[PDB]
Amino acid sequence: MEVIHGQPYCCRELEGADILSDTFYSNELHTPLETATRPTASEDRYQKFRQSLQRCR
Amino acid sequence: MREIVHLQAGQCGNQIGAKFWEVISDEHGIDPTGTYHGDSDLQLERINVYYNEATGGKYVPRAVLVDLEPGTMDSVRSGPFGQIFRPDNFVFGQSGAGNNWAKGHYTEGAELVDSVLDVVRKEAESCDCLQGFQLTHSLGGGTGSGMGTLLISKIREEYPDRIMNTFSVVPSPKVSDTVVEPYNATLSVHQLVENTDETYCIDNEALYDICFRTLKLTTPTYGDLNHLVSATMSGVTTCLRFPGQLNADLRKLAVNMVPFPRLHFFMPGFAPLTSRGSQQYRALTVPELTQQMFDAKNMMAACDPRHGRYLTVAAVFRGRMSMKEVDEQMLNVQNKNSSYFVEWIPNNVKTAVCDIPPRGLKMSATFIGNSTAIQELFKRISEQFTAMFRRKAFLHWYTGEGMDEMEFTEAESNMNDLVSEYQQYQDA
Amino acid sequence: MREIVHLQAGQCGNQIGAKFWEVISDEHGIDPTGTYHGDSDLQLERINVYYNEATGGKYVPRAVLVDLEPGTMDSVRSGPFGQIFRPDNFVFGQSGAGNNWAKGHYTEGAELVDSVLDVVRKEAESCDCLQGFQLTHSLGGGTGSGMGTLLISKIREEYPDRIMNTFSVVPSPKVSDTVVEPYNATLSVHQLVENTDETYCIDNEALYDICFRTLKLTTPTYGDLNHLVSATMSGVTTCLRFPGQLNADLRKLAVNMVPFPRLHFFMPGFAPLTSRGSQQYRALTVPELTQQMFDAKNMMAACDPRHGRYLTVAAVFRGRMSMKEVDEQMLNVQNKNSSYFVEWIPNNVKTAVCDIPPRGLKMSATFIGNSTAIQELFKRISEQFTAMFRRKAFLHWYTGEGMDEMEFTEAESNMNDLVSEYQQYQDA
Amino acid sequence: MRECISIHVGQAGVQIGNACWELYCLEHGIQPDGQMPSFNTFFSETGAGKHVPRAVFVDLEPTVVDEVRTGTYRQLFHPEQLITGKEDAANNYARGHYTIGKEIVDLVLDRIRKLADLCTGLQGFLIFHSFGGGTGSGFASLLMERLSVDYGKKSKLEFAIYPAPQVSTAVVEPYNSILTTHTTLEHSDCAFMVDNEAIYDICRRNLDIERPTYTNLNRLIGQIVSSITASLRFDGALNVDLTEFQTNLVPYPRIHFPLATYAPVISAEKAYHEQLSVAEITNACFEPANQMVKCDPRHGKYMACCMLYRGDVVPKDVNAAIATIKTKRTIQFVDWCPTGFKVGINYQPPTVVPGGDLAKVQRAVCMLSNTTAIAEAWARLDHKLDLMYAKRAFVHWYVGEGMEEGEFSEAREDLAALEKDYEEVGVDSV
Amino acid sequence: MRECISIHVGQAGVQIGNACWELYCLEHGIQPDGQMPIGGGDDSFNTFFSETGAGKHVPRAVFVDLEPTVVDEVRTGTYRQLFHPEQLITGKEDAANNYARGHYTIGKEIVDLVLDRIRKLADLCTGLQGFLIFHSFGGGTGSGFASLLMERLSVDYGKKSKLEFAIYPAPQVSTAVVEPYNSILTTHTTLEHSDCAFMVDNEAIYDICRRNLDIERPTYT
Amino acid sequence: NYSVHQNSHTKYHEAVRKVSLKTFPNQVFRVPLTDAQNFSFWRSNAAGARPEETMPWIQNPRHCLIKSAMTRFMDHSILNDRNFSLY
Ligand SMILES: Nc1nc2c(ncn2[C@@H]2O[C@H](COP(=O)(O)OP(=O)(O)OP(=O)(O)O)[C@@H](O)[C@H]2O)c(=O)[nH]1
Ligand SMILES: Nc1nc2c(ncn2[C@@H]2O[C@H](COP(=O)(O)OP(=O)(O)OP(=O)(O)O)[C@@H](O)[C@H]2O)c(=O)[nH]1
Ligand SMILES: Nc1nc2c(ncn2[C@@H]2O[C@H](COP(=O)(O)OP(=O)(O)O)[C@@H](O)[C@H]2O)c(=O)[nH]1
Ligand SMILES: Nc1nc2c(ncn2[C@@H]2O[C@H](COP(=O)(O)OP(=O)(O)O)[C@@H](O)[C@H]2O)c(=O)[nH]1
Ligand SMILES: [Mg+2]
Ligand SMILES: [Mg+2]
C-alpha cells in the first residue's frame, strides 16, 4: 500500500526481498565515522527501510 | 563532460560492480529511488560522469549488465540499490556457459555479443565527450572471462583511442575455486595483454587475509569482501568527480604508470583500514597512512613486493592535507627503501590529492603498484597450465566445441613471453 | 471552417473510429455524454473541424457510420464513446458482405450507396468550407474493401478538387485473417491509385511488434492496437485545430509528399512510444525523439525502410519545444542517412511544430513517410494474387456475381505499373 | 438482426438437436419451458415473455419426436414445428425421396415459409442430417431440392455423420452415401462433416471414459455447432457471419467437404493441472490424434483453414500460433493457396452441458479445414459400391420404390469424376 | 528460467522420488494439491514445478515403470492431485531382471510414449539445463530401459546435460543373482551417451545409519 | 471410500485413473500399513493444514530467488512465440 500523487494503491507483492542478503551485507567498520546507520549495515535498519518504502510489482 | 561507460560481466562483476554502485550512490547522496537528497551542492556538478539525467531529480547509472544466465542478474535487482539501473540495459541469455572459456567466447557469446554491443554503443553515442570504459569481471570462469575478453576485443576496434580498464580477479595460490582455472586464466590474459589499457589484480585469499588479520573480522561476508574492492576502485576515479589541489584523471594515471606496452598489470591497496577497537589507539595523519599504503599485508594481490622491484607506484591521496608532508613522505619512502626501486627511473612515485575522501572516513589514499614481483602469479598460472596440458587434462570440453590445441600453445607461449620480459627488466 | 468529413465502412472502420473519436473527444474536452468541458479556450476555437452543432450545450461528430451487417454498429452504439454519434448516420442493411469484392461493390453495397450519400451530402453542404474526406476501412474484408472504394469513386465525381485521406489496413505475409484476401486487396488498391489523394498503409503485425518490443504489452487487446492508428490520425491534422509556430494542414502534406500523382502511399509512425515500467528511466528530449521516429522497428507497415530509399518525409511535432534542435537534427538525420535518400531531391524532410500536446503526453510527434520500400508490399501481394489466379482458386464467388475475367487482369496490370513506377525512381 | 434457421431431419439430426438446443438454452438464460427467469438470432419472442426456438423437427417415425413432445422440452418448441411421419424410410433413399417422403414436404416447407417471414434478416440454413439411413438421406435431399428454388442464393450449410472407414450400423451404407451426394453438390454450399469412430477414440484417448454412448457422443457435436454459430450470438474482436463460411472454405464449386476439430477436449481432472495457452490448443488442432474425421492429415495437403476462438483469448499470441505453423514441414499446404488461414475471435467462454464430461475451460478452438486427404474416404466408399454393385446387391428394394437402375451407374461415374477432380486440383503447378 | 527434468525409472527410481517430492514441497510452501495459501515474492519452485492458470503446481517428473504395482501407490497416496496422471506411465509386466527384456522385447514400445511426455515437459520448459534419471544397476527396467532412454535422448535432445543416478551393486551381497551381468550390460551402452553418473552404494548407507545415525534395523526411509 | 469402487475392481481402477477416491490413508488406519504409505502419513491433507502451525519447530525463512520482471517477460515470450528473440 503506497500513495501515489495522494491517492492510495493496493499491493499484492513488494519489491526485493524481505530479508537482507549476505552478498550485499557489508559491515559498518568500512564506514566507521558515519552518523545515521546505512540499511546495508544491519537487518533492523533494512527492516525499517522496507517499512518506509512500499512499491507493488 | 568526461564520461565512463560501465560494464559488468559474469557473477563476479555483477556482484562487485553492484556493490560499487551501492558505495558511490551514497557519495553523491542519491536514494534507492534515485531522487537526489544531498546536503551540499558540491556533490552535484559532476554527476554526469557516472549517472544519467532523468526528470524530477531522478538519476540513472549507465551499466550494461551482461551474463549468459539471469539468476545473478535477478539477485542484484532484489538488493537495496537495485532499481536505479535501466531495465533495457539488462542483457541475458538462456543457458549458462559452465565455467568454460570456450562456451563464453564462441558458442553462446557469439549469439549475444551483438545486442550488448548495440546497447554499449547506444550509451557511448549519447556521450558529451567520451573518455573510456569500465569492466568488472574475473579470470576464472566462462561467463566473466569468455564474455569480458570478447567484449573488450569488440570495443577496441571501434574506439581505439580511448582507454578500457578491466577490474579483474586472479586465481589464488593455496586453494582454487574452479578446476579449470588455469585454462581460463591463460586464455583470458592472452586477450588482455593485447587489447586493454590497464587491469587490476585482485586475489580472493589476499582479501581473506586482510579481513582476518588487519580488519580483525571474525565472519567476513561477501559484502565485507567486495566493499574493499569498491573503495579501492572508487578512489582511482575521484579526480574527475570532485575538485582537488592536484587532480590526476584516468589518462593522467595511464601515462604515469605503464612504461612498455605489455607491462600494465597493476596491484591496488587502501590506506585507512583499522580494526574496531584500534580507532582511539591510532592517530590519523599522512605518515600513519603511508605506513599502511606500502604495507605488504595491505596489497590486494598475493605477491610480496620484497621478492621483486617496483617500476612506478601511484598514491591517490584524499583529503585534508598539505603536500609538503605528502611529497616529503614519498621522498622518505623512496630514500630508505632504495634497493627495491629500479635505478633506471629516477623518481618512482606518483601522487595526487582530492579534498573529498570516501563516505565515512576522514582521510584516505588508494595505493596503485606496478611491481615486478607480479611475475610469480603468472609463473604459477604457467606451470599449472603446463601440468594439466602436458598429458591432456580437461580439454575435450574445449577441443570438442570450437578450437584445437594450437590456440592453447600460442597462448601459453604468449604467457611465457611476459615472465621472461619481466625478468629481463628486473635486473636492469 | 477547414472541416473534415469522417467516413467508416466495415468492422475495421467502425472500431478504429470508435477509438479515434475517443482520442479527439479527449483532446477537445468532450464528455462522453456529449457536453463540452474543456478548461482552456484553445480547444473551443477550432472544434468545427471534426464536430457539429447540437442543442443544450452538446456537440455531435461529423461522422457517418455504415456497415452492411447490423452487428458491428450494435457494439459501436454500446461502446465507450458511442452515445455522441447521431442516430441518423447509422445507415445499414440486413446481410453481411461476406469477404467479397462483388458483394460490396456491385449488388449488395450498390443499393446502399444512395442512402449513405444522402447523409454525406447533408453533412458536406452543411459546412462552411470542406477540405477533405476521411475514410477508415480494411483492404482484406468485404464491406470496407468493396463498398469503401465505391464510396470513393462516387465522392471524387461530385467533389473533384477536395483532397482525400484513406487509412487502410494492409495484408500480412506471415499469417492471414481472410482466406480470399489477395482477391480483395488488389481490386481495392486498383480503385485507390487513381481516385484518392493521400493513402496510409497500416499493418497489424507491425503493430504487434510495436506492442511486444516497444510497448512491452503481454496481452494487447484491439483497443491498444487501434489507439496507435487513432493517435496517428489525430496527429496528422493537429495544425488545423491548434495554433502552431509552423502550420501544416493536409494539403501542405499533400504537396510536400506527393512529387508524382501516383506515388502517395505512406508509412505512418508515432514518436514517444515506451514501455510502462520503463517510463521514469526514459528522459524524453528531441534527440531521442527524432532517433525513435526513424528506426526500422517503429513503422506501422511491415516494409522495412532499410531495403529502400525515401522520397519525401514529414514530421509534425506537438507540444512546447524549441526549433533549433528540430531543424538541426533533421539536418543530422538527412546527412547521416544520405544513402537512404534520393539525390535528385535536395531537401527531403517536412517539419511542423504546434504548441498543444496530446492529452497525457508533453512532447509527441507523428512520422509520415513516402518511401520506395513499399514496392515489396505490392510485390508480395502480386505474387499472392498470381499464385491464386493462375489456378482460378477462389474465382467463382466473383464471376457468379457479375464480374469479368477482364478485371483481375486490369487490377494486376495496375499493380505492376505501380511497382515498376516505384522501382524506376530508385535509380537516380 | 442476424439469423439462423436450423433443420433437424432424421434420427441422428433430432438426437443432435436435443443436445445443441440443450446448450443453446444455457448460453442464454432461458428455462426449458421457454421462459426467462443478443438472443434473437436463434430464439423468437412471444408477448407474454417466452422465447420459441427457430427450428423444425421432422422424422418419418414418431418414436424419436414423441420423447421430445413428452419430455422436458414440450413447452419450448412450437407444437407444429415437430413434424411427425408415420412410416419410416427403412434405410432407403427411395422411400425418403420418392414415395412417402414426397407426402410431408408440403408441410415442412410450409413451416419453413412461416418461419422465414418472422425474421428480419435471414442468411443461412443449418440442416442436421446423416448419410446413413433413409430420412436422413432421402428427405434431406428432397428438402435441398426445394430450398434451392423457393428461397434463392442463401447459405445452405449441412452437418452430416459420415461413415467411418470400417464402422457402420447398416448394410446399405454405400448405397445411401452414393445418392445423397447427388444433391449435396449442386444444391449445397459447405458440408461440415464428422464421423462416429473418431469421436469414440477421442472419448477414450483424450477423455478417460470407457463404454461411451450416444448422449456423450452428441454433446461434442453440440459444442462444435455452438462454436460455429457463436459469432452470430456474442460479439467479439473478429465476428464471423454465416455468409463467409461458404466463400472461404470452398475453392472450387464441387469441393466443399471440410473436417471439424474441437481442441480442448479434456476431463475436469486434467483441466486444472494443465494450463492451455492458445499456442498449444492450436497445435492440438492439427494433431493427427485429435481428428474428429478418421482421415490422418499427413497423406494430403491443406486447402483452407478456419479457426474459431472463444473466451479469454487475445489476437497477438494466436497470431504467433499460426505464425509457427506455416513454418512446420509436416503440416503441408497446397501451392496455389499461399493465404491459407482464417481466424475469428469471440469473447464468451464455453459452457458445460449439465451432468457433462467436458471440463470448465476458458479457451476453445474449432478447426474447419478443407483437406486433400479426404479423397481416400471417397476412394474406399466407391470401392465398397463396386464390390456391392457387381452382383446387384440390395437393388430390388430401391427400384421397387420409384428408382431406375441407371441412376446407380450415373451416381458411380459422378463420384468417380468427383475423385478425379479432387486429384487434379491437388497438384503442384510448374 | 533454470529448471531440470526428472525421470524416475523402476522401483529404485520411484521409491527415491517419493522422498524427493515430499522434500521439495516441504522446502517450499507447496501443498499436496499444489494450491499454496503481505510481503515479497517467491519464484524458487520454477526449478521443479510449473504454475498453471488455475493456481496449481505440477512437478516436472515422469514416473515410468514396466511394473504396475509400485508406481500405483502414488495414485492412491497423497500426491495424486500433485502429479498430472499422464506422467505416471505403467506397463503390465516387469522385466524380471532381464536386461534383454526391458531393452529389446517389452520396453521397445513404451519409448515412443515416454519421449512423448518428455517432449510435453520440454515444450513447457523455459530454459532446460539438465536431466535427472534415477536408475539402479540391478534389475531390468533400471538397466535395460534406462540405457535405451539415454540412447534415445542423446540423439533426440543433442547437447544437454544428462545427470543420472546409480545404486551400485554391493561387494559382498546382492539382492538378485544376475546383477553382475546387468551392471556390465547397463554400463556398456551408457558410457558413450551420458555426461555424469552419480554413484551410491546401499550398505555404505546402512553403516552410515548404523554408526552415525544410530538407529537399529533400518529400512527404505 | 465405498461409493467410488462399489466393491468392484473395475470401478476401483476407473476411479484410480480418473482420481475420484475421497479418503486418504490417514483417517482410516492409525499406522502406515503399506511401507510406501509412510512418505505421506504425517502430512494432514484436510484443506490447508500446514507443517508450521502444527509442530512449530521446522520453521525456516526462505532465501528464495525472485525472478525479475525482465525475466518474467522473457519467459512469457519464449513460452508463447518461438519466433520472438528479444536480446
Ligand atoms: N453422432 C450421432 N450419430 C447418430 C445418432 N443417432 C443415430 N446416428 C447415426 O445415424 C445412423 C443411423 O441411420 P440414420 O441416418 O439415423 O437413419 P434415418 O435416416 O434416421 O432413417 P430412420 O432410422 O428410418 O429414421 C447411424 O449409423 C449413426 O451413426 C446420434 O445420436 N449421434
Ligand atoms: N534401500 C532401498 N533399496 C531399494 C529400494 N528400491 C529399490 N532398491 C534397490 O534396487 C536394487 C535392485 O533393483 P531392482 O529391485 O531390480 O529394481 P529395478 O532395477 O528397477 O528392476 P525391477 O525390480 O524389475 O523394477 C536393490 O539392490 C535395492 O537396493 C528402496 O526402496 N530402498
Ligand atoms: N568478490 C567476489 N568474488 C567472487 C564472487 N563470486 C565468485 N567470486 C570469485 O570468482 C572466482 C571464480 O568465479 P566464477 O565462478 O568463475 O564466476 P563466473 O566467471 O562469472 O562464472 C572464484 O575464485 C571466486 O572466489 C563474489 O560474489 N564476490
Ligand atoms: N488493426 C485492426 N485490424 C482489424 C480490427 N478489426 C478487424 N481487423 C482486420 O480487418 C480484417 C477483417 O475484414 P473486415 O473489414 O472486418 O471484413 P468485412 O467487414 O466483411 O469487410 C481482418 O484482416 C482483421 O485483421 C481492429 O480493430 N484493428
Ligand atoms: Mg436414423
Ligand atoms: Mg520391479
Side-chain angles (χ1 to χ4, degrees), chain B residues 125-352:
Chain B
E125 224 277 351
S126 300
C127 263
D128 315 299
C129 79
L130 203 38
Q131 173 184 20
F133 283 74
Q134 200 172 8
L135 180 49
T136 59
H137 75 134
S138 46
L139 310 181
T143 174
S145 162
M147 287 285 299
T149 52
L150 180 56
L151 253 64
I152 283 321
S153 172
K154 283 320 207 325
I155 280 171
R156 183 50 182 241
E157 33 159 356
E158 333 165 88
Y159 311 127
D161 35 10
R162 329 317 293 190
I163 51 145
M164 311 75 77
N165 327 315
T166 86
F167 289 40
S168 43
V169 164
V170 278
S172 199
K174 312 167 16 194
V175 47
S176 92
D177 230 326
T178 311
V179 187
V180 189
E181 270 195 89
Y183 283 167
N184 302 4
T186 312
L187 302 182
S188 209
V189 162
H190 163 47
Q191 287 299 119
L192 278 200
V193 300
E194 208 206 74
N195 286 319
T196 170
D197 185 11
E198 46 91 14
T199 89
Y200 290 171
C201 272
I202 310 298
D203 165 342
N204 272 262
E205 87 167 52
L207 269 83
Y208 281 137
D209 203 308
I210 284 174
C211 328
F212 187 58
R213 273 206 67 256
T214 292
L215 291 183
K216 204 278 186 143
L217 273 174
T218 44
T219 54
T221 75
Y222 254 112
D224 272 25
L225 196 156
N226 301 322
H227 207 300
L228 298 214
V229 195
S230 94
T232 184
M233 106 173 87
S234 87
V236 177
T237 206
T238 193
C239 298
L240 60 151
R241 304 201 321 290
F242 282 109
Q245 281 166 332
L246 183 52
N247 304 268
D249 50 319
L250 254 62
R251 194 90 70 101
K252 200 82 131 201
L253 256 45
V255 293
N256 296 165
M257 296 270 333
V258 47
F260 299 94
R262 294 191 220 90
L263 273 78
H264 54 89
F265 287 116
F266 283 30
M267 154 160 42
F270 198 60
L273 283 172
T274 57
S275 100
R276 171 203 152 75
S278 297
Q279 293 309 122
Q280 296 93 346
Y281 299 150
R282 175 219 188 88
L284 60 176
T285 44
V286 178
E288 277 217 279
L289 297 162
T290 62
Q291 75 127 339
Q292 244 171 330
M293 281 196 38
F294 299 91
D295 158 43
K297 321 147 167 81
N298 201 64
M299 312 305 217
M300 280 152 181
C303 55
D304 223 332
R306 263 141 170 160
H307 323 297
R309 283 170 194 247
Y310 281 112
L311 298 183
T312 58
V313 309
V316 186
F317 284 79
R318 281 177 83 149
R320 161 97 53 113
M321 26 203 95
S322 154
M323 42 284 293
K324 195 262 263 188
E325 55 288 14
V326 169
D327 254 9
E328 78 153 344
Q329 260 303 318
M330 301 302 146
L331 160 66
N332 298 318
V333 168
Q334 201 188 191
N335 280 329
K336 174 172 311 273
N337 318 85
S338 92
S339 59
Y340 290 148
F341 288 97
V342 283
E343 90 86 10
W344 56 290
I345 271 175
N347 219 107
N348 295 280
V349 167
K350 300 308 284 242
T351 89

Side-chain angles (χ1 to χ4, degrees), chain C residues 73-142:
Chain C
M73 331 156 272
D74 211 8
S75 66
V76 163
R77 178 65 187 185
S78 162
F81 263 86
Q83 227 75 2
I84 43 162
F85 294 112
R86 184 181 260 280
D88 317 53
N89 320 62
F90 279 108
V91 313
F92 47 87
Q94 305 305 313
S95 164
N99 316 338
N100 251 344
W101 207 79
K103 278 209 178 292
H105 199 90
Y106 277 139
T107 76
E108 142 53 56
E111 72 155 50
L112 216 31
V113 157
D114 173 42
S115 191
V116 70
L117 256 287
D118 176 7
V119 153
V120 163
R121 275 202 272 274
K122 155 78 162 303
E123 287 281 347
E125 293 291 36
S126 70
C127 93
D128 184 346
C129 171
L130 285 210
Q131 161 172 121
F133 291 91
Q134 253 182 21
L135 180 65
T136 64
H137 64 280
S138 45
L139 308 181

